[PDB]
Design a protein around this ligand. Structure first.
Ligand SMILES: C[C@@H](CS(C)(=O)=O)Nc1ncc2cc(Oc3ccc(F)cc3F)c(=O)n(C)c2n1
Length: 345
């Protein structure tokens, strides 16, 4: 039945959680670390801030829950629990999400230094494993960066940050990590983008782990494209046709043409197989980028690749994305998803 909830003021909000969650402590809606006495796990508990304040917000809330409930993979963030203190739909106003407490993100691990090749193999392998599973469900991360990759002591990695509001124009401006890992087509809105935007991001991450340095640290959007094009070459006629934005295409043709650089001269001392893979991921034309499934099969991951141990996901119905509903309707849909939740084994 319904557990007993207890109340507590933490990060400026009154948190109301089942008794099973103890020793709540703020770590940054807002988030608390806790001990789940029922599982023995240290957990992170997110209370969503005004989850139903607008259609936009109620729909984002539904998206996040839908996304988190679908994820059942070792290398992807999973939902341990979701709850509301509410007894009915009419009383329903607050949503709490529970996941594993993560130790350190990839920024904490890389920290301005090169990693050993085997460490890079292992980390990128797991990212690609998780991405294969995510992409098989037609889900795109869109925001892959080191701060969204959490790792434990054994270097066991999970992809985080699903259904978030996604960064506004102001936090994509300037010399910012929020933009350095974004594919060019999505950074400058060239065209309708596909799953391989995430592969660009993996390339940027993998290069950073190899060299200890941000690959494309642009001071702004234009600076960044210039760094990108200096490495990968200016686009050919084939790709230009695909840039459906006429203004964007017009700006590209203004730039002095440049050939693709020799990656072995850029990533000096690196595994030739790492270099080869980097070249296949950092392809300007998204149509020609390596997929997660293809990259897992690349010779660079010979020691980890197991086709029988790289599962796909169940189908994810996202028809709701193109649906127009009122706040109360997204709220009722969200409520059904809270009450129907079945905890992992
Ligand atoms: C000390 C840090 C290391 S870090 C930043 O993960 O690298 N630990 C940690 N662990 C897990 C989360 C989960 C978060 O968000 C959630 C997402 C889905 C949920 F179901 C529940 C959540 F709380 C979150 O916002 N933070 C800040 C977290 N922090």
């Amino acid at each position: 039945e319904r557990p007993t909830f207890y109340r507590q003021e933490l990060n400026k909000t009154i948190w109301e959680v089942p008794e099973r969650y103890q020793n709540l402590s703020p770590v940054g809606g807002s988030v608390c670390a806790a001990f789940d006495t029922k599982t023995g796990l240290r957990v992170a508990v997110k209370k969503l801030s005004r989850p139903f304040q607008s259609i936009i917000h109620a729909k984002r809330t539904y998206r996040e829950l839908r996304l988190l409930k679908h994820m059942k993979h070792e290398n992807v963030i999973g939902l341990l629990d979701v709850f509301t203190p509410a007894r009915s739909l009419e009383e329903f106003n607050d949503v709490y999400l529970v996941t594993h407490l993560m130790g350190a993100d990839l920024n904490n691990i890389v920290k301005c230094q090169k990693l050993t090749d085997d460490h890079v193999q292992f980390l990128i392998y797991q990212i690609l494993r998780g991405l294969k599973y995510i992409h098989s469900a037609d889900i795109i991360h869109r925001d892959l960066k080191p701060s969204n990759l959490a790792v434990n002591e054994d270097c066991e990695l999970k992809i985080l940050d699903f259904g978030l509001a996604r960064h506004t124009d102001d936090e994509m401006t300037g010399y910012v990590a929020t933009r350095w890992y974004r594919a060019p087509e999505i950074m400058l809105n060239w065209m309708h983008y596909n799953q391989t935007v995430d592969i660009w991001s993996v390339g940027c991450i993998m290069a950073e782990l190899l060299t200890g340095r941000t690959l494309f640290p642009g001071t702004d959007h234009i600076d960044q494209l210039k760094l990108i094009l200096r490495l990968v070459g200016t686009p050919g006629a084939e790709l230009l046709k695909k840039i459906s934005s006429e203004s964007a295409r017009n700006y590209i043709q203004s730039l002095t043409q440049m050939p693709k650089m020799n990656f072995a001269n850029v990533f000096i001392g690196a595994n030739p197989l790492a270099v080869d893979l980097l070249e296949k991921m950092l392809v300007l034309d998204s149509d020609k980028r390596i997929t997660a499934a293809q990259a897992l099969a690349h010779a660079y991951f010979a020691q980890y690749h197991d086709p029988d141990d790289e599962p796909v996901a169940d189908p994810y119905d996202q028809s709701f994305e193109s649906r127009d509903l009122l706040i109360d309707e997204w709220k009722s849909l969200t409520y059904d998803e809270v009450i129907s939740f079945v905890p992992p084994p």
